[PDB]
């Protein structure tokens, strides 16, 4: 499941970098990084499978919300220059 987890991590990062709002993008990227590094040493396959299921649900939520946020997008923050 090493390839599956890495592919899911890559997909989530790729989709989260598409968040139009600065706050949502930064939070999503940082949270994905921290959550994947926190469960790095998890050995129970049941726990791993539960984590992957939550990961796919979060991926679907992120995809939908990124699309919604680009349909209704505003100006960038002063810090984004």
């Amino acid at each position: 499941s090493r390839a599956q987890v890495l592919a899911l991590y890559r997909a989530m990062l790729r989709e989260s970098k598409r968040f139009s709002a600065y706050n949502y993008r930064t939070y999503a990227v940082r949270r994905i990084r921290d959550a994947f590094r926190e469960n790095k040493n998890v050995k129970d396959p049941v726990e791993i499978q539960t984590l992957v299921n939550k990961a796919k649900r979060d991926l679907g939520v992120i995809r939908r919300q990124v699309h919604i946020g680009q349909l209704y997008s505003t100006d960038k923050l002063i810090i984004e220059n």
């Binding site: 921290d34 939520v61 919300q65 919604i68 810090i79 984004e80």
Partner: protein, 402 residues
Amino acid sequence: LRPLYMDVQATTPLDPRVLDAMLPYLINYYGNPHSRTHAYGWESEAAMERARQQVASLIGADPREIIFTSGATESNNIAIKGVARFYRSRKKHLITTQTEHKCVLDSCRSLEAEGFQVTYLPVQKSGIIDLKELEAAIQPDTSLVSVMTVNNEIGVKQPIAEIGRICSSRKVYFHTDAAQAVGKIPLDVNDMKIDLMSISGHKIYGPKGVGAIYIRRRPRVRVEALQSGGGQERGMRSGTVPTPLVVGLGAACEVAQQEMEYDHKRISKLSERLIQNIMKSLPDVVMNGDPKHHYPGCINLSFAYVEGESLLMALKDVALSSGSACTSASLEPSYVLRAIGTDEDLAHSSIRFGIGRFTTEEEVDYTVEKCIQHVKRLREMSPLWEMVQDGIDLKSIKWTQH
């Protein structure tokens, strides 16, 4: 280009997961939750029950103890006025704090106009009530005690567990305003001996116009309903329960329950960074409120010899708030700062910094840098700064006021 939002105490951005949960009920599942005959009503009711369970799980209560409101203002009104009116026959005394939110205070003012006696407990310089005054202020006809969980202006935490123990030992109902505390610090109504609790959706990254009130059922505390109608929400809050709003509130409560520990660590780190960076650069900056019992998300700083409206105008790229009277419609200074004993010279210079779930290190550094630069500039523009630098303290040198 939009400014940076550092005003989480006023309101929060909607969490994307919360909006994701809401959207099916804003498009497809639009039925009235109180419809008993068709599937739209059944699905709306099931969503409402799930949200109620989520809120109860967050605050560690039974779902039957959760009542959905339009916000923490309505929840505070229901708690204060309903408890006061139900037990009017025997109990005619109320105890609250001078630093409570405007809703609780104004409710106490209305009940005083209705013939109730209200005691406004003073606070120490730390912003924390002293428990000896609370014990001495309890009368045989005291019905309700209202103490803020986390202050919305200075971020000071009150000893909720000790206050609840005192109230339970004296057979007095205890209500706490947890609008700034829910989802940010651990809360358990059973261990804290809380009888009533107010929850605000838009303080926890949920929807606006939604809220929750917790009413304990064992032992039972009774409230007289303030909204009259069909008896929805067990007869305490009539009217249709808005399904998207309560669904969003439940989703926000679930997200907070899942993310509280991570959020608290991040926010503590960022708050320490902001405070230390500001203190190590600008002299004569002090934090309003006791740092030992302080929620790191809400930081209130007073920048001596600079006024807070001018500083707010300087930091136009940052969205902040101040307790200065120059920012009020009625020119009313912050009563919270008056209560904590801040001298008149220094509460005109308070700035409230807000750090939350969506605050970045990038933003904190920018805010700190701009604050340092503009405070130095405004101090170079100030005459009080010259008086202090010349060695003539402001207490011994005067000018013609008026």
